[PDB]
Coordinates of C-alpha atoms and ligand atoms in Angstrom, one line a residue:
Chain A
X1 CA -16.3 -10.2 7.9
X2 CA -12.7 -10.0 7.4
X3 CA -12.7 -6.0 7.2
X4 CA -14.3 -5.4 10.5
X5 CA -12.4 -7.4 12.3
X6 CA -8.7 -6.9 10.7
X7 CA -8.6 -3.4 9.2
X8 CA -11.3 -1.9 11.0
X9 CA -9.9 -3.7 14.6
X10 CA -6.8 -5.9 14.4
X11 CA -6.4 -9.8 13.8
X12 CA -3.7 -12.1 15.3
X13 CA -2.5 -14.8 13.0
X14 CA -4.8 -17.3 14.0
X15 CA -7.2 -14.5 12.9
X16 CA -6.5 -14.2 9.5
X17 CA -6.1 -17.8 9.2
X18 CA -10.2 -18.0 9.9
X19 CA -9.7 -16.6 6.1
X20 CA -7.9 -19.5 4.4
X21 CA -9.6 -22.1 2.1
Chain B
X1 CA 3.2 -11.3 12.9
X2 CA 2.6 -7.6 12.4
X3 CA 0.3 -6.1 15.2
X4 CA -1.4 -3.2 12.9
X5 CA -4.9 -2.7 11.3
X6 CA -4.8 -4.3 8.0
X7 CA -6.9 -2.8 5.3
X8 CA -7.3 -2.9 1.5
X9 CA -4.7 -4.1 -0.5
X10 CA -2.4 -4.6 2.0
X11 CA -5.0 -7.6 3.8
X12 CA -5.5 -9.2 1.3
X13 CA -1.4 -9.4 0.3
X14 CA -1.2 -10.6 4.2
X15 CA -4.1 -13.5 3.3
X16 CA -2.5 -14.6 0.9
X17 CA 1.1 -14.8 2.7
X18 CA -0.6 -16.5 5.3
X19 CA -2.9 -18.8 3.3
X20 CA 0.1 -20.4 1.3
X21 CA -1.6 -23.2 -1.2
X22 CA -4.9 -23.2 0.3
X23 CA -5.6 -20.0 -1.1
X24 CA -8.5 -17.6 0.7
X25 CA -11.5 -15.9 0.2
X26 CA -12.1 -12.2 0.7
X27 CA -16.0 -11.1 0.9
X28 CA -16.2 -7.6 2.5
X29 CA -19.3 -7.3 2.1
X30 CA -20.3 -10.4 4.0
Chain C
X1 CA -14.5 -1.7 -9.7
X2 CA -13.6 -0.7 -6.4
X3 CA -15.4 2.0 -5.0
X4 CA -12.9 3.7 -2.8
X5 CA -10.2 6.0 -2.4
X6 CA -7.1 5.8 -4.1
X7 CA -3.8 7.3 -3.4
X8 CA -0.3 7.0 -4.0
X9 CA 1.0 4.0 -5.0
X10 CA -2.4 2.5 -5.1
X11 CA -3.8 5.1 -7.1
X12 CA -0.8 4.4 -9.8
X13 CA -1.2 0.4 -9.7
X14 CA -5.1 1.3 -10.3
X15 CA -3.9 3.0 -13.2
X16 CA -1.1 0.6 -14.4
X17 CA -4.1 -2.1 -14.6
X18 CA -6.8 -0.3 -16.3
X19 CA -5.2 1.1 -18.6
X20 CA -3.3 -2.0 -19.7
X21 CA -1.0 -1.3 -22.8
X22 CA -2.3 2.2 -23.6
X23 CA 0.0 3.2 -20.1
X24 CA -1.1 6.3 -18.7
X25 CA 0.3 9.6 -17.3
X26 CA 0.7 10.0 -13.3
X27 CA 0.9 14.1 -12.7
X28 CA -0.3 15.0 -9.2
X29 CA 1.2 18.5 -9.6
X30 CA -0.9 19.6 -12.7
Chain D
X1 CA -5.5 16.5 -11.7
X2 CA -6.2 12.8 -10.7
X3 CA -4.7 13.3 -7.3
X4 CA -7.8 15.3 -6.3
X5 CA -10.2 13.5 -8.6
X6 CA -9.2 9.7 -7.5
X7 CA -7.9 10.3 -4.3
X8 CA -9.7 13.3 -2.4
X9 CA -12.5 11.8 -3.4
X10 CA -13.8 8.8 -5.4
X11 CA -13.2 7.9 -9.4
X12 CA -15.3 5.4 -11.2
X13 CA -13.8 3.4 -14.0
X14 CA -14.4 5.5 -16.6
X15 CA -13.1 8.5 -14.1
X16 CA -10.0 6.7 -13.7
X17 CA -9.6 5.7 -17.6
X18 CA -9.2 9.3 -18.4
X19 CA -5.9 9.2 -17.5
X20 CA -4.5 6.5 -20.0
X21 CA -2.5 7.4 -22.8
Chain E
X1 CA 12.1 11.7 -4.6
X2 CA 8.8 11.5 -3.3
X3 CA 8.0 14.3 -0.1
X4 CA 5.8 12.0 1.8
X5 CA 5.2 10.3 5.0
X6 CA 6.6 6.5 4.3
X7 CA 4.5 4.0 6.3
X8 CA 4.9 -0.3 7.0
X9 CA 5.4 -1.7 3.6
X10 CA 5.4 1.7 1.6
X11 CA 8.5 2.5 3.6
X12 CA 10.1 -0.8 3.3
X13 CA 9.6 -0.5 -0.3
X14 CA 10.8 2.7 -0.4
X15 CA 14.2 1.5 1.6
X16 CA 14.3 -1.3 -1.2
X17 CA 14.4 0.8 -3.7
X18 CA 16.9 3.4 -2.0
X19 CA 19.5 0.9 -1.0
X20 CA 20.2 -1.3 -4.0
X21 CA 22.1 -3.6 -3.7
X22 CA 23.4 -2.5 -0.5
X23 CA 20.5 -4.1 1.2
X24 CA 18.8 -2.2 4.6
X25 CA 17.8 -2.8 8.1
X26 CA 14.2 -2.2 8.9
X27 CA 13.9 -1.7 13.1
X28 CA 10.2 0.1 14.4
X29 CA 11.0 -1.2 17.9
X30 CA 14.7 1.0 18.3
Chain F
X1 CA 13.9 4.9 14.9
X2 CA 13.4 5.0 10.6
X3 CA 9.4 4.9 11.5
X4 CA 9.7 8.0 14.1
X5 CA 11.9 9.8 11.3
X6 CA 10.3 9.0 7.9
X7 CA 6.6 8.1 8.5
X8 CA 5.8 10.3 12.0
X9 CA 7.7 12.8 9.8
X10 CA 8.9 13.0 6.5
X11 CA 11.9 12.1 5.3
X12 CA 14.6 13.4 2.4
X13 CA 16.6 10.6 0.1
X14 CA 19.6 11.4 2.4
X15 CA 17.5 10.5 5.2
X16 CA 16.5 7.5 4.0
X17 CA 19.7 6.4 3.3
X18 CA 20.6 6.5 6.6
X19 CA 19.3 3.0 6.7
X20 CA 21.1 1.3 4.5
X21 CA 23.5 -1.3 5.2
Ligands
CL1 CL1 -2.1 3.0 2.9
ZN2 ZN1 -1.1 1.5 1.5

């Protein structure tokens, strides 16, 4: 999930983006 | 972009930033 | 609700939400 | 105070609701 | 004023609100 | 650095001012 990989480790853009609709 | 450990409130202000008009989802439970 | 902690600024937007028009009273010295 | 009820550790709704006006 | 450490977008806000209409320069790298 | 001075440490109004433009 998004926690584990942004707040628990950190996400690059293109990351966070895997989030979007 | 920021290069820190985004958690809470504060990742889901960056989602939506990011997201624009497609909007997100956030599931931490997953 | 959210099941975490809250502090700060977050505690007081936690606040300013559930307590909707009543308002509510921040004193962290007490 | 709420600081060490809400913050120091964990409030519920209700917790948190004691607190409003 | 608050007496607390001011982190990312807590200290930015903070500088916001400080500065007015002054305006502010936010540099972490120095 | 404002980060080094006012979230490593803590910093007054006055401090904080420093910043501005
Ligand atoms: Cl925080
Ligand atoms: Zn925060």
């Amino acid at each position: 999930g998004i926690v584990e990989q942004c707040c628990h480790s950190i996400c690059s853009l293109y990351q966070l983006e895997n989030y979007c609709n | 972009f920021v290069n820190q450990h985004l958690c809470g409130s504060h990742l889901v202000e960056a989602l939506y930033l990011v997201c624009g008009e497609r909007g997100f989802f956030y599931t931490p439970k997953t």
